[PDB]
Amino acid sequence: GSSGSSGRKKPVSQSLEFPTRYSPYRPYRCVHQGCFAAFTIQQNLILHYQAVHKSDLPAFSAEVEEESGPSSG
Ligand SMILES: [Zn+2]
């Protein structure tokens, strides 16, 4: 006897969402009194402390995963 089979898989078109290749303002700014550095991404900001002051960011919070932020108005 004899027989065959078919198979395939189309790729995925992964696009970007970033608004601008680079942001002018940065919400994250080193607290260290005397450090002119900042990183848009919270992550890229972590290493900065380990690359400059070879340390990790401070602690100003506790085991909490809530928002309860001041909604508009
Ligand atoms: Zn710093």
Curated annotation (Swiss-Prot):
It comes from the Eukaryota. A zinc finger (C2H2-type) spans 28-53. It is found in: Nucleus. May be involved in transcriptional regulation. Belongs to the krueppel C2H2-type zinc-finger protein family. It is linked to Intellectual developmental disorder, autosomal dominant 64: An autosomal dominant form of intellectual disability, a disorder characterized by significantly below average general intellectual functioning associated with impairments in adaptive behavior and manifested during the developmental period. MRD64 is characterized by mildly to severely impaired intellectual development, speech delay, and autism spectrum disorder in most patients. Additional variable features may include motor delay, attention deficit-hyperactivity disorder, and non-specific dysmorphic features. This is Zinc finger protein 292.
